[PDB]
């Protein structure tokens, strides 16, 4: 199984820590587009108690263009409140990359405009909802994609 | 829609803060079984930036028996690594209560033994996985239940 999570300029250490654990638990690979809002050395990152092996799921990319050149994503989805289909209304498949913006801002227009409407997904919410925690949102999208594929690799 | 999340003796403030936001975003109601590992006044709880209205989704119960007497749950599910069906392999319905143990321990045997095997659910994971963050786990179960019901109340 090849499913990928992409974090664009993540800002808050414990969110990234949680998402690393999430990838380790699901077999998803993690891609980080620099710069991050914190150092890898940050004490808040590994409060998670992350093992050495868990970091082998993580690849760093200097910028978005470098990410595209290294990974050549076959399909790139972006989570955005501006999206149209629900995260569960699309059909994920091997090779997909699922991209998320920073905790305090959306993904840049220059990226969002490169994607067709059907690849910009949104997590359903009640009217007048507030922002969801980023690691929560990634967990929801990841587990929904993994569900659709029948949880390959799970015990 | 009447779906309920139950936290048994939650320990870590930001997890509960995130789960409160989660309930506000989904229309789920939150039930807390005391005692908590932190005070409501805890600075770490509202780093979340929780609005006053969001706290109206929360009811506190002095202990598990008091919870049962006040709520009279029609069906009670428990998330446990010991569970048998996946969280997505059961069929949620109006009136369900979804119960979660503390971040650093399972739910007590005296509660788990009261539940049939089919009501003890587990989130799928790869072999040799480590513990999932509690707010991540609740988000996954909540969004899966809400998906099954067709996201009633979502914009």
Residue numbers in the entry:
A (entry chain A), B (entry chain B): 0 to 154
Please quote the paper that reports this structure:
The enzyme responsible for 2′-O-methylation at the 34 nt wobble position of the isoacceptors and in E. coli was recently identified by mass spectrometry and designated TrmL. However, there is a group of minimalist SPOUT members, which contain only the catalytic SPOUT domain and lack the extension domains. Our results demontrate that the minimalist SPOUT Mtase EcTrmL functions as a homodimer by engaging residues from both subunits to bind tRNA. The overall structure of an EcTrmL monomer subunit is composed of six β-strands and six α-helices, in the order β1-α1-β2-α2-α3-β3-α4-β4-β5-α5-β6-α6.
By solving the crystal stuctures of EcTrmL in apo form (2.0 Å) and in complex with S-adenosyl-homocysteine (AdoHcy, SAH) (2.0 Å), we identified the cofactor binding pocket and the potential active site. The space groups of apo EcTrmL and EcTrmL-SAH were P32 and P21, respectively. Both crystals contain two molecules in one asymmetric unit, forming a tightly packed dimer. Structurally, the dimer is formed in a ‘perpendicular’ mode, i.e. one subunit (green) is rotated by ∼90 degrees with respect to the mirror molecule of the other subunit (cyan). The N-terminal half forms a Rossmann-like fold, which is common among SAM-dependent MTases, whereas the C-terminal half forms a deep trefoil knot. The knot is formed by threading the C-terminus (residues 121–157) through a hoop composed of residues 78–86, which forms a hydrophobic core that stabilizes the polypeptide knot. EcTrmL contains many basic amino acid residues, comprising 13 arginines (8.3%), three lysines (1.9%) and five histidines (3.2%) in a total 157 resides, most of which are located on the protein surface. SAH binding does not significantly affect the overall structure of EcTrmL.
